[PDB]
Structure 1
Amino acid sequence: GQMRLPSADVYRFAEPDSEENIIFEEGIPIIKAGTVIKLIERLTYHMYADPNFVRTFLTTYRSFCKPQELLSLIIERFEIPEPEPTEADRIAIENGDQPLSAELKRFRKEYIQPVQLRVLNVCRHWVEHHFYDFERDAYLLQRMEEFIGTVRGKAMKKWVESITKIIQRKKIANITFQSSPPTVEWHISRPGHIETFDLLTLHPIEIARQLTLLESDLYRAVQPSELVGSVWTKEDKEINSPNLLKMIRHTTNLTLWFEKCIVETENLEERVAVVSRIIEILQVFQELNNFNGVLEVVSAMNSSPVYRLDHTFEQIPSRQKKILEEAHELSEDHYKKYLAKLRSINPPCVPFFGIYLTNILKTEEGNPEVLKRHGKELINFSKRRKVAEITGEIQQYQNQPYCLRVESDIKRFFENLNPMGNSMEKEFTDYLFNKSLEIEPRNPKPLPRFPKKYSYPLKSPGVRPSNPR
């Protein structure tokens, strides 16, 4: 038969399942809703491990349970009473013999040790992947250190001593590749001559590579703590979502820089060279699976100041119009082709983050925190699972590093890019649109001519890489 359990009066996690405390979705069960006690029981269940539930729960639990309360509950879960001797054990002891203790040994092996190990696995994952709870609450860390440091008994000892060391390392806190990265490419600007760096003087291949390294690093730095609770939209967004906002502000600045490069090139022939170079950068972004970069270019080309430059458009080669068209088509029909492409490529890649943000926000706004059943309020866990499916997808693309060499000066150039200067956003985007009107006036005003501004050759070196010995 099944193992008997402690009385639910001395150990709360032995209460029977019912629809008043847990609801399953229609080979392990999937939880739709439950009390916090039932969620923690299933988080640390004696019959099976559920590592994706551990991640889901530790990512999302703060919407229904405070960190201090979670720790109290898993300590309570850990402290399992052992059963008393059975009648057969009693009779053995009365005869001066050693009892077999069969039921006690089974309960230790099949209930206590798995539940206790799974509690420790929650602690291990909490410290390793959600350490911000402890960075923000020193007393919580003290409690965790004390709990782990006072677990007795040899069955758990290896993991207790390990988790103690992991905590101490987290308090004070290298890549290998299948091949060598390709050689850094140079065009008009030569190494060390940062003062000449610009859109047309750096090599377009290397512009795309260094922006991809920068944008990959920005993508990889965003933690789930910046996303759950929709905190990047709320009044404290600068406190709670700083890496996400840095990533978005880079994307915005690059889009505006592309627009500024275009409309501040008043000579038509030179402006065609600028737009053609930006489409070449887009081509390399596509080759690198940098979808953030792809959309940075698409957003610039579809902006009000650039979109209307029909005289510039007319001179762009057909093959480049086709590249831009197929990049824009990724975004059509609610990103249908983008989503399919992201799921088909071989990483590394840089996803576009905005879709994830909208899906997390709408999942949190469109589903209730609790379900009411039989007069009880149950935590709606399905809603949290949906959010954690999105954060899990984000994390999956954060693992793979690009095999590209950093160029420190080109990296610094793009880190320090500031197209708006000291101007406010409305000021600056009105300026860009007025420049567009200046360089290609609305019909029927005649098209003026403008002097050249670039003293160096406009011919692109192209985007196929070179390889000397």
Structure 2
Amino acid sequence: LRLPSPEVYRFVVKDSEENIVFEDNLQSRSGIPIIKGGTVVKLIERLTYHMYADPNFVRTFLTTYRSFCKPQELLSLLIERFEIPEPEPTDADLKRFRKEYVQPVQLRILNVFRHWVEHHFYDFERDLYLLERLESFISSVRGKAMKKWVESIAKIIRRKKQAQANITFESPPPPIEWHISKPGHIETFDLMTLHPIEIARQLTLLESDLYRKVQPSELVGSVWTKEDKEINSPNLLKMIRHTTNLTLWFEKCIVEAENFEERVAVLSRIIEILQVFQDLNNFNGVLEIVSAVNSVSVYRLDHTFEALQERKRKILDEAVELSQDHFKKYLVKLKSINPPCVPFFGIYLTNILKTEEGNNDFLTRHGKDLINFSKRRKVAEITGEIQQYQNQPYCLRIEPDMRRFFENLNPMGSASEKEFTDYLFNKSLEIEPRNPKQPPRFPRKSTFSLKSPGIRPNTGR
């Protein structure tokens, strides 16, 4: 009984469709009401509710909130929630208010701070001032019952800060495969001089590392395509730039092979790399090669595809078919394999862009910003799927020169992506013109043997 005036404490304005909307279905019938949307004020009140704990909302909120609220604003709202004014005295009660309202709300805030530093410390890593505000506030908290919670948050922060201020094989990894390029000779590194097995291994290790660093929150609210993308989505942007560069590198290697026999040997080696990606459950790599071969500059090279060994063309068509019918066969395959694996990342992006586009950010902006929370629950269920393959490392040894090589691929050089893709298209028309004549005969500029060592481990034995 008796809360402060909504006038002096914004959270306790009465619930109405002006400020908060609950699911009204058979699921929402039992237990804790399900939030469909509200003002950020009302979402914060329900995140820290006096009447019950809501672990599920806390988890979904801290995954999704940056799509509707800045980290600095979240901290300001949790402090505002914490600083609870006394009710209007009546002057002819406090003791109940402190036991049943204040203490439970303050404990629930400290529990949100605890989940925040435990599972989303990257917010504080990205913003040292945010951490200064949090540390200053937590150390101001003097409540007897708050003490265990403050100690717990302090210890998490101490640990996260330690594990910032600075590989272990559970079984023998395979020996590194070498072909024409030899170690230390990084300047001789090329698609055709490195071993196709080890190209697939080193790209898988790199792609696995990029994949495992992507936080769900980098995807929520299409934040990687927005103004604050370099800070909200740094891991995702690195993974997207990697995919772009590698896909364009594969295209470049094919289209710049002017000599027909060389270009066939290049496409054949890329298909061999694709088979080792498949053996490694690197569907990310499989579908990068699919992306390259379906690019307009390569797709149209009918003479090159027709010249492939039937078995190589078969393997490619099968890879290509994984992507057909909204990735139907890819999704069957992904559910059938044993990790480690690198999921095709592009499809999470596609399905989040469609959910982001097809659902309003706001239940309405008339009179109030009424945030669509249900939209964020649906995106968090998609981002949730990214997590099940981030926990299983590859049993493969890093080749530091090859890793360096692949981290630094820059097919575009100083040109724009559009200038570069125009170039690939113009070169495609040069090497295989739109006429019915046999393909032009250009000389090789490279002197290395075209003969593949194949994808049976050599040094392995």
Instruction: State the TM-score bracket (shorter-chain normalisation).
Output: 0.7 to 0.9
Evaluate the alpha carbon distance shift between residue 448 and residue 31 of structure 1 in structure 2; reply closer, same or farther with a 3 A threshold: same
Which residue number corresponds to residue 86 of structure 1?
none
Q: What is the CA distance between 1:32 and its match in structure 2?
A: 0.9
Does the 8 A contact of 1:276 with 1:316 survive in 2? yes
Q: Is 1:59 aligned with 2:63?
A: yes
Q: Is 1:123 aligned with 2:113?
A: yes
Which residue number corresponds to residue 147 of structure 1?
137
My pick for the range that moved more, 348-357 or 297-306, is 348-357
Q: Is 1:269 aligned with 2:261?
A: yes
Identity %: 82
Which residue number corresponds to residue 42 of structure 1?
46
User: What aligned pairs does 1:431-442 form with structure 2 within 5 A after superposition?
Assistant: 431-442=423-434
Deviations 1:80-130 (A, max 9, x none): 7999xxxxxx9xxxxxxxxxxxx979x95x877665443222102222443
**Which residues of structure 1 form unaligned runs of 5+?**
84-89, 91-102
> Alignment partner for residue 392 of structure 1, among 384, 397, 406?
384
**Hey, what's the Cα distance between the residues in 2 that align with 1:249 and 1:112?**
48
Q: Is 1:187 aligned with 2:183?
A: no
Evaluate the alpha carbon distance shift between residue 465 and residue 17 of structure 1 in structure 2; reply closer, same or farther with a 3 A threshold: farther
**Which residues of structure 2 form unaligned runs of 5+?**
26-30, 88-92
**Hey, what's the Cα distance between the residues in 2 that align with 1:157 and 1:254?**
52
Q: What is the CA distance between 1:296 and its match in structure 2?
A: 1.4
Q: Is 1:323 aligned with 2:309?
A: no
Q: TM-score with structure 2 length normalisation?
A: 0.82
Which residue number corresponds to residue 343 of structure 2?
351
My pick for the range that moved more, 44-53 or 298-307, is 44-53
Does the 8 A contact of 2:177 with 2:459 survive in 1? no
Evaluate the alpha carbon distance shift between residue 466 and residue 378 of structure 1 in structure 2; reply closer, same or farther with a 3 A threshold: same
**Alignment coverage as a number of residue pairs:** 445
Q: Is 1:298 aligned with 2:290?
A: yes
Which residue number corresponds to residue 260 of structure 1?
252
Q: 1:7 is aligned with what amino acid? A: L
**Hey, what's the Cα distance between the residues in 2 that align with 1:20 and 1:434?**
58
Q: 1:160 is aligned with what amino acid? A: V
Q: What is the CA distance between 1:394 and its match in structure 2?
A: 2.9
Q: What is the CA distance between 1:58 and its match in structure 2?
A: 1.9
Does the 8 A contact of 2:126 with 2:231 survive in 1? no
Evaluate the alpha carbon distance shift between residue 423 and residue 20 of structure 1 in structure 2; reply closer, same or farther with a 3 A threshold: closer
Q: Is 1:74 aligned with 2:74?
A: no
User: What aligned pairs does 1:157-236 form with structure 2 within 5 A after superposition?
Assistant: 157-170=147-160, 173=164, 176-224=168-216, 226-235=218-227
Deviations 1:11-55 (A, max 9, x none): 776677555543322254321123434423332345654434223
Does the 8 A contact of 2:206 with 2:403 survive in 1? yes
Which residue number corresponds to residue 28 of structure 2?
none
Q: 2:174 is aligned with what amino acid? A: P
Q: What is the CA distance between 1:270 and its match in structure 2?
A: 2.6
**Hey, what's the Cα distance between the residues in 1 that align with 2:193 and 2:126?**
46
Deviations 1:160-200 (A, max 9, x none): 11312333454573955542322211222222222322212
Does the 8 A contact of 1:145 with 1:167 survive in 2? no
**Hey, what's the Cα distance between the residues in 2 that align with 1:178 and 1:316?**
40
Q: What is the CA distance between 1:207 and its match in structure 2?
A: 0.2
Structure of greater Rg: 1
Evaluate the alpha carbon distance shift between residue 113 and residue 185 of structure 1 in structure 2; reply closer, same or farther with a 3 A threshold: farther
**Hey, what's the Cα distance between the residues in 1 that align with 2:193 and 2:51?**
64
Q: 1:36 is aligned with what amino acid? A: V
Deviations 1:355-387 (A, max 9, x none): 333333343333233335998763321112223
My pick for the range that moved more, 214-223 or 338-347, is 338-347
Deviations 1:370-424 (A, max 9, x none): 3359987633211122232233333443333322211001111112222233334
Does the 8 A contact of 2:303 with 2:439 survive in 1? no
Aligned with 2:37: secondary structure? strand
Does the 8 A contact of 1:21 with 1:378 survive in 2? yes
Does the 8 A contact of 1:20 with 1:374 survive in 2? no
Does the 8 A contact of 1:20 with 1:373 survive in 2? no
Evaluate the alpha carbon distance shift between residue 223 and residue 432 of structure 1 in structure 2; reply closer, same or farther with a 3 A threshold: same
**Hey, what's the Cα distance between the residues in 2 that align with 1:62 and 1:424?**
31
Q: Is 1:445 aligned with 2:441?
A: no
Which residue number corresponds to residue 328 of structure 2?
336
> Alignment partner for residue 408 of structure 1, among 400, 408, 412?
400
**Hey, what's the Cα distance between the residues in 1 that align with 2:83 and 2:57?**
22
Q: TM-score with structure 1 length normalisation?
A: 0.81
Which residue number corresponds to residue 96 of structure 1?
none
**Hey, what's the Cα distance between the residues in 2 that align with 1:194 and 1:387?**
43
Aligned with 1:188: secondary structure? coil
Evaluate the alpha carbon distance shift between residue 148 and residue 235 of structure 1 in structure 2; reply closer, same or farther with a 3 A threshold: closer
Does the 8 A contact of 1:372 with 1:378 survive in 2? yes
Q: 1:305 is aligned with what amino acid? A: S
My pick for the range that moved more, 450-459 or 325-334, is 450-459
**Hey, what's the Cα distance between the residues in 2 that align with 1:346 and 1:156?**
45
